[PDB]
Scaffold this motif. Structure first.
Motif, short mmCIF file in Angstrom:
data_model
loop_
_atom_site.label_atom_id
_atom_site.label_comp_id
_atom_site.label_asym_id
_atom_site.label_seq_id
_atom_site.Cartn_x
_atom_site.Cartn_y
_atom_site.Cartn_z
N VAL A 174 27.86 -6.99 -4.95
CA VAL A 174 28.10 -7.16 -3.53
C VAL A 174 28.23 -8.64 -3.17
N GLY A 175 29.26 -8.98 -2.41
CA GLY A 175 29.53 -10.36 -2.01
C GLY A 175 28.77 -10.80 -0.78
N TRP A 176 29.14 -11.96 -0.24
CA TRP A 176 28.45 -12.53 0.92
C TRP A 176 29.40 -13.08 1.98
N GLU A 177 30.71 -13.06 1.69
CA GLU A 177 31.75 -13.57 2.61
C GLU A 177 31.63 -12.99 4.02
N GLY A 178 31.62 -11.67 4.11
CA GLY A 178 31.44 -10.97 5.37
C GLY A 178 30.10 -11.30 6.01
N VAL A 213 32.76 -8.80 0.10
CA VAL A 213 33.65 -8.28 -0.93
C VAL A 213 34.50 -9.31 -1.67
N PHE A 214 34.37 -10.59 -1.34
CA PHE A 214 35.30 -11.60 -1.90
C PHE A 214 35.03 -11.99 -3.35
N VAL A 215 33.81 -12.42 -3.65
CA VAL A 215 33.44 -12.84 -5.00
C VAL A 215 33.48 -11.68 -6.01
N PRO A 216 33.12 -10.45 -5.57
CA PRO A 216 33.30 -9.28 -6.45
C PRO A 216 34.77 -9.00 -6.77
N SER A 217 35.63 -9.03 -5.76
CA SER A 217 37.05 -8.81 -5.96
C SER A 217 37.68 -9.92 -6.78
#
Ligand SMILES: [Cl-]
Ligand SMILES: [Cl-]
Ligand SMILES: [Cl-]
Ligand SMILES: [Cl-]
Lengths: 534, 534
Positions: free
Chosen positions: A120-124, A308-312
């Motif tokens: 899980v990312g942190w961008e959002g 969702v950014f770093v995961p994608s």
């Protein structure tokens, strides 16, 4: 003229600093909570040292969803969608998501989610934080006007987003650019200096490759990657909406807990560590991205803070490496598998996000910017292709989570429908007359509380428009007209395709309907926008 | 939904190619015309060899202003200002500037202006060209709809601008980014992919440093440089308007010719050649930028094609070298004078232009992008600073040349003025009734030619709105109502601070005024916008 500029500059700098400062402390707490979790394991035997890794992992994912539950459930999910909502003209409706108590359920939820080993990312979540911090500053006297002014609130809340994003990637321009591409529907060019300012402020706080032009094969990867981004957003929604339609009302920990356990086990034979390594240019890698493709798509549907950014970024690089290797053989040693992972990571986030900025983001981060052109074409193709199948992951999340979002039309309204078909008759809706005495107006005022505008018409009622609260309440403090509010009035034959436009550009809460001059009906903003409300 | 995309994609690709192709031919024609001029000189003796350089130089500047005169004087000046006008909502008024004949006076004028040795760029003229090419494709059947659709014409003419700019710098992202910062008032995020596409197309056609973080001193240069950009725009306007107020009606060649001669002489002890040289890190350099500061400011006022970017690039670099040298001594050998010229060139164009993009442009061109942060701060300070004193050189040019430009208010109207103060009475303006027979409507139609909308009211007239030409002319071909046009109606007490807003966002030509329900007055778009027209 100058007190204007210095007020604004003061705000944006004080925002940008304390935003990138708070996010640094989030990041600092994630790097500790992981090392704690690691100590727990290495202190016991090897056999149990593995299970105590998994147990601690589920525990922290359970604590994650618990934080949202016990503080503010409005903090579940990304946050960007929830914000895209606010900047769309629903600030009055979604104002709840910016409460101080939600900052805690976001930042406690995030630390524990990433800590527990969720893909899980942190961008959002991060953008969401910056907005709440920016909303808190709004409470100081010198800054309060910044929220008041409809226009000035839009542009500032947008700068929160910018510094929120740019801090998440440690790429100031990449950030602000990605910001305008996603939160915004349209964008006032003024703001761009306000968003840059608030981003560089946090950059200063935070201050304390080669892709050959064999581009034709990169664009082929761009095309395919769009199709995979499409499938990704398609998966997120379908995995989600089969939990709501079927097996619905599954609650919290059993849901989060299964995904936590299932995850830590599904990755048995296998963050910013892997990335740089695929970017280095030197089976078991076919399953890697495919497992994480499913695992991430599933995880962002969870009732907890999820970017969702770093995961994608990983999922792209992985597919880019699989392509970069299957091209290694077909075209000779001249092909370098490393540079295809770079174009891979960029194009897939550009498939899922639809942000052309991902090209700039990969450059700013470790990229040297040898040439954008190859990367920028393949990032673009991915958008044009995935822009055919799908809506943007953020827009799809807006649908998926049922959030008032002005630019999408209600599922049940044709753009051909006349305003007359959707308008609410004036008889049931509150209205005022000039002739109605002070004894009268107290009635509507209390019987329709929360009402801020009162449509004012004559006998055989003809159009004008008075305020409610600032004037009527103060013109009552002595015991009507002249009016002070101009409403966007529209003729009864004007259709939805054009009501919807006024709602997106002008951004009002209500539109009056004129039939032969007479006020015949109000059209609520809930009557046209795809708004979940609730 | 696919025939939609492929149409658009086909348009942008066929625009972008032929735009960067035509501009390549302009560039090719300048590099020959200069070499011709050089041959003429080196064939004669040394004494005369110098005077034949100057004489040829004046001649080509005379031929330059002649081209505009003999073809289309609408091709005089930058072009971007003339376009900023069109994209502002005055396409119907300024359509004349996009005529095919104006493409020739632009591209011939430019070749001869830079050929004759004028301190004159091509950024502006170049954007102008791209729009006219884009406008020509608009004539083909498959593409005509792209102009018809108000929204879709905006987005595509914007892409012309992007490929126009991007090609002028040979920096695709830098180009499209600079484009959104300057032509646009607001910007539909959709277009960003259409602009990137049309830019990368021309990049593919065209395909056929280190700044230490001693930033404090760069920000001090950013501050100063903004103040110099302010003075630059201040000079352009004042040197211009003293030619109009005093010594007015001086005609063409004598004006152009004096500046040509005066120039070639004033540069006796002294393009992309100098730049790279100051960028290399290794008296008579104090006068260089100061002379060119005056010389350029003066030249872009001339009646001929004149961009300003590449000239301003020199003037900054020069000042940045003067600063980078005066810092060399004060702080020690550790200071490198070369990197201060880079921040210099970027910050000054950012002063005059107010585009934060010049930071990205300098990177994309030869820049390696070591770090933006120092450069990006100093480029921003320059904007915040010069943003205090001045309006952008383009906006100031719009004033200076008196062009209809929606977002600036008329010099003579307060935002406090009621629509009633400025509205045009409905008795003198054309209107229609339902009862008025076919024998009647032929009257207004011919006596008010060119009228496209007819306001339709009852007896004791109450609001509706019918078209003129598509319906009334076709409903006449048999010998009224229902209506087909919804006009943005506004109450008589609504003030200019809000008429002006509707004109910028909704972009209409007219707004109807409602007094107690009755149609009482039209407000022309000429009544509020700072529009010289003519
Ligand atoms: Cl979400
Ligand atoms: Cl992230
Ligand atoms: Cl001009
Ligand atoms: Cl130029």
């Amino acid at each position: 003229s100058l007190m204007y500029l210095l007020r604004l500059v003061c705000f944006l700098t004080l925002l940008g600093v304390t935003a990138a400062l708070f996010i640094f402390a989030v990041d600092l707490a994630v790097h500790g909570l992981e090392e704690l979790r690691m100590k727990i394991s290495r202190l016991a035997g090897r056999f149990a040292g593995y299970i105590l890794y998994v147990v601690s992992g589920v525990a922290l994912c359970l604590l994650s969803t618990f934080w949202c539950a016990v503080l503010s459930t409005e903090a579940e999910g990304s946050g960007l969608p929830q914000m895209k909502s606010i900047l769309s003209g629903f600030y009055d409706k979604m104002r709840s998501a910016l409460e101080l108590r939600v900052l805690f359920a976001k930042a406690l939820g995030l630390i524990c989610a990433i800590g527990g080993g969720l893909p899980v990312g942190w961008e959002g979540p991060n953008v969401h934080i910056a907005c709440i911090i920016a909303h808190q500053f709004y409470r100081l006297g010198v800054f309060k006007e910044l929220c008041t002014d409809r226009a000035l609130r839009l542009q500032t809340l947008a700068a929160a987003c910018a510094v929120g994003l740019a801090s998440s990637f440690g790429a100031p321009l990449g950030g602000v650019l990605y910001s305008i591409e996603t939160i915004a529907s349209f964008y006032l060019v003024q703001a761009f200096w306000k968003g840059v300012l608030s981003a560089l402020s946090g950059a200063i706080v935070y201050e304390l490759d080669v892709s050959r032009t064999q581009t034709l094969l990169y664009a082929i990867l761009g095309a395919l990657m769009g199709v995979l981004g499409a499938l990704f957003i398609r998966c997120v929604r379908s995995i989600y909406e089969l939990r709501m339609r079927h097996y619905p009302g599954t609650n919290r920990y059993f849901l989060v807990g299964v995904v936590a356990l299932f995850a830590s086990a599904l990755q048995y034979p296998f963050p910013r560590a892997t990335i740089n390594d695929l970017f280095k240019a030197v089976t078991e890698l076919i399953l890697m991205p495919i497992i994480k493709f499913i695992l991430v798509a599933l995880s962002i549907g969870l009732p907890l803070p999820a970017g969702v950014f770093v995961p994608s970024f990983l999922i792209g690089a992985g597919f880019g490496r699989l392509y970069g290797e299957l091209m290694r053989v077909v075209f000779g040693n001249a092909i370098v598998p490393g540079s295809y992972a770079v174009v891979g990571a960029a194009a897939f986030t550009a498939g899922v996000t639809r942000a052309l900025s991902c090209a700039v983001i990969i450059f700013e981060v470790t990229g040297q910017i040898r040439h954008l052109v190859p990367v920028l074409i393949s990032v673009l193709l991915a958008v044009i292709v995935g822009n055919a199948f799908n809506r943007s992951l953020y827009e799809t999340l807006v649908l998926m989570k049922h959030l008032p979002y002005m630019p999408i039309l209600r599922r049940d309204r044709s753009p051909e429908m006349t305003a007359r078909e959707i308008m609410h008759p004036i008889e049931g809706e509150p209205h005022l007359f000039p002739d109605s005495e002070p004894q009268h107006i107290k009635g509507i005022l209390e019987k329709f509380p929360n009402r801020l505008v009162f449509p004012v018409i004559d006998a055989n009622g003809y159009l004008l428009g008075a305020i409610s609260r600032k004037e009527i309440v103060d013109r009552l403090q002595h015991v009507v007209v002249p009016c002070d509010v101009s409403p966007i009035v529209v003729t009864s034959y004007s259709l939805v395709r054009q009501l919807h436009f006024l709602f997106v550009m002008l951004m009002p809460s209500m539109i009056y309907v004129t039939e032969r001059g007479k006020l015949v009906g109000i059209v609520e903003r809930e009557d046209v926008a795809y708004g979940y409300s609730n």
